[PDB]
Design a protein around this ligand. Structure first.
Ligand SMILES: CCCCCCCC(=O)OC[C@H](COP(=O)(O)O[C@@H]1[C@H](O)[C@H](O)[C@@H](OP(=O)(O)O)[C@H](OP(=O)(O)O)[C@H]1O)OC(=O)CCCCCCC
Ligand SMILES: *[C@@H]1O[C@H](CO)[C@@H](O[C@@H]2O[C@H](CO)[C@@H](O[C@@H]3O[C@H](CO)[C@@H](O)[C@H](O)[C@@H]3O)[C@H](O)[C@H]2NC(C)=O)[C@H](O)[C@H]1NC(C)=O
Lengths: 97, 86
């Protein structure tokens, strides 16, 4: 997945305010020590841009992650019972006609 | 196995109860595979009437009457002693 956080200024345009990440890539810390039970944060990326609405152009900092889902829970719950219940279906070939 | 994997978070690893569930799944299948082998090695389509050549009691049945309960008994003495202590 690609989950984003969209930081933006509401009332002040780019003529009234300016946004920047303080410290470049050393501006968002503590990401690597986050532990999720079913996901794993592969990468995070920081974007500085401007968006143009009808009322003007506003600054925007976009913070985003790259969550990758762990597989072994779904192997333990969904895939392997379906595999075993499919192996059970071919027991019937050995029973007499 | 499906209902036991509820009201706990979706962790990637396998708990002790999941190991117990795998061993029990195996013991309930090896039993099914044992019956499949017995039915592969069966012969006539008539049972004993209590009074022709009739079927015999399978040697796989007489071994699994002893080996399957003891191997589950050995597993319980291993599993419950290892985790209750830890
Ligand atoms: C999951 C385990 C799978 C094991 C698969 C093991 C598969 C395997 O090896 O089968 C062969 C044999 C089958 O024996 P079983 O008693 O089931 O079958 C008899 C056997 O075939 C005799 O030879 C037959 O007499 P005959 O000669 O025709 O006159 C007799 O016919 P009838 O006299 O009634 O007409 C048959 O009923 O089993 C063992 O020797 C015990 C193995 C125990 C192995 C360990 C089991 C825990
Ligand atoms: C998750 O999704 C977001 C949004 O789709 C990704 O952000 C995008 O990242 C690329 C790579 O940095 C950006 O392209 C760059 O744009 C700048 C603009 O000046 C340009 O100078 C660079 O040469 C490059 O082309 C892209 O703009 C950006 N998307 C938006 C809407 O800003 C992100 O990479 C994805 N992955 C992660 C791990 O976050």
């Amino acid at each position: 997945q690609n989950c984003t956080l969209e930081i933006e200024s509401y009332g002040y345009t780019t003529d009234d305010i300016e946004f920047y990440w303080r410290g470049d890539d050393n501006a968002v810390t503590g990401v690597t020590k986050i532990e999720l039970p079913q996901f794993s944060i592969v990468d995070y990326k920081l974007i500085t841009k401007k968006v143009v609405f009808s009322t003007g152009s506003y600054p925007r900092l976009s913070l985003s992650f790259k969550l990758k889902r762990n597989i072994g829970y779904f192997i333990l719950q969904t895939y392997m019972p379906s595999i075993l219940i499919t192996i059970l279906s071919w027991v019937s070939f050995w029973i007499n006609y | 196995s499906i209902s036991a994997r509820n009201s706990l978070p979706k962790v990637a690893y396998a708990t002790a109860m999941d190991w117990f569930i795998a061993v029990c799944y195996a013991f309930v299948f090896s039993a099914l595979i044992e019956f499949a082998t017995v039915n592969y090695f069966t012969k006539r389509g008539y049972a004993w009437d209590g009074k022709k050549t009739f079927n015999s009691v399978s040697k796989i049945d007489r071994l699994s009457r002893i080996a399957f309960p003891l191997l589950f008994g050995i597993f319980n003495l291993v599993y419950w002693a290892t985790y209750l202590n830890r």
